[PDB]
């Protein structure tokens, strides 16, 4: 798909995504914190439609992600991100999408997710996370 | 003076300051780099006018600041930043203002200046810099 | 089991561990780099015996870990790390242990593993990694 790189920020205020139980993650967009100011990241849209929308509103700055987990799997011959879960110090957001395929989990003991990069075609192909203290 | 904090960014593209040959530094504004794009910082203006303006355009990302030095002294009973010099791996920009009073120097062996904070009344009262790898 | 925490260092020169083909990872020991010199980390030992030792000797600094993956699973009613694999920019060391249960994966696009912490009982219960630039 189309590669994207939001880069590094001061923190996370909101995560916007979409999913289909029959396929994978469709949308990915992040509202970051930038030196106290919310910063609307570029909208990483699917090439298609039929996704269930999800808005993850974080109680920034007291609420921050402690774990990003999910599943990868084959959807129409492409290895993509099927499911996503975001766990904070307050609650668990997800799972958004079916919990099938290869599990992956990035728990955090110290530090924070400060940014996202990856690729979106029909669905989220891959992603990486910027980590900082 | 009126405090400011631009916070943290990804590097520096341009510094816009003003000085008076008899007093100190007045105005201070940075065009920061944010995730590969320029990010126009807040104009930190002095309470007064009659300052000479100077633009320090950097050949970003190849050109970066290696040292910031200058002078702090007393102007009308106030300890203010009287002079500023920005030294890159390619050029020395300065000194700007009055090179009188007490010198200070920040040489960088590893890392980069990614943000500025401080205070401005009639003149630049003080400043700090955010350093990142 | 018993928790351990080696803390943070300058890099990795060697990984000494032990495994059982029917159970999990037993002992875990790291020869760290500390400012251009080897630092022998403490040997975290299983409370039982019968493991196969393994020495992952690295060509430090040119060779460094890019990925740590493995499996977590149940052995005698306990969730333990059943298998580990270390992929440098030069080779894949492993898998060592039992390639069964829930997989996990830590690819690193930027930065380094500079330390380990975790817990060992009869087997390696869990582990975490320190990451730095």
């Amino acid at each position: 798909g189309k590669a994207f790189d939001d880069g590094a920020f001061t923190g996370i205020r909101e995560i916007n995504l979409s999913y289909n139980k029959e396929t994978a993650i469709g949308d990915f967009q992040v509202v970051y914190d930038l030196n106290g100011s919310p910063y609307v990241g570029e909208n990483h849209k699917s090439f298609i439609t039929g996704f269930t929308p999800v808005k993850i509103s974080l109680d920034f700055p007291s609420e921050y992600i402690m774990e990003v987990s999910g599943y990868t799997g084959k959807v129409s011959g492409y290895v993509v991100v099927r499911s996503l879960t975001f766990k904070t110090n307050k609650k668990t957001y997800g799972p958004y999408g079916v919990t099938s395929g290869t599990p992956f989990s990035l728990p955090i003991e110290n530090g924070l997710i400060v940014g996202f990069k990856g690729s979106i075609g029909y669905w989220l192909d891959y992603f990486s996370m910027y980590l900082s203290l | 003076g009126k405090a400011f904090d631009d916070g943290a960014f990804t590097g520096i593209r341009e510094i816009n300051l003003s000085y008076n040959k008899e007093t100190a530094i007045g105005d201070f504004q940075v065009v920061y780099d944010l995730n590969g794009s320029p990010y126009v910082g807040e104009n930190h203006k002095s309470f007064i006018t009659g300052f000479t303006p100077v633009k320090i355009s950097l050949d970003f990302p190849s050109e970066y600041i290696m040292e910031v030095s200058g002078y702090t002294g007393k102007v009308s009973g106030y300890v203010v930043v009287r002079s500023l010099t920005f030294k890159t791996n390619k050029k020395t920009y300065g000194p700007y203002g009055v090179t009188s009073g007490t010198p200070f120097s920040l040489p960088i062996e590893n890392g980069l200046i990614v943000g500025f904070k401080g205070s401005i009344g009639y003149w630049l009262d003080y400043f700090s810099m955010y350093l990142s790898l | 089991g018993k928790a351990f925490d080696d803390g943070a260092f300058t890099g990795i020169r060697e990984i000494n561990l032990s495994y059982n083909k029917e159970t999990a990872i037993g002992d875990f020991q790291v020869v760290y780099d500390l400012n251009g010199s080897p630092y022998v980390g403490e040997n975290h030992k299983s409370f039982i015996t019968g493991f196969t030792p393994v020495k992952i000797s690295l060509d430090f600094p040119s060779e460094y870990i890019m990925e740590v993956s493995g499996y977590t699973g149940k052995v005698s009613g306990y969730v333990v790390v059943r298998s580990l694999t270390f992929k440098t920019n030069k080779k894949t060391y492993g898998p060592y242990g039992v390639t069964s249960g829930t997989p996990f994966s830590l690819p690193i696009e930027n930065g380094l593993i500079v330390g380990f912490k975790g817990s060992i009982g009869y087997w390696l219960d869990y582990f975490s990694m320190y990451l730095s630039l």
Partner: peptide
């Protein structure tokens, strides 16, 4: 370089 570095983990997916 004048670009600020950050620890990057991933990718997960393709």
């Amino acid at each position: 370089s004048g670009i600020s570095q950050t620890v990057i983990v991933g990718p997960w997916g393709a």
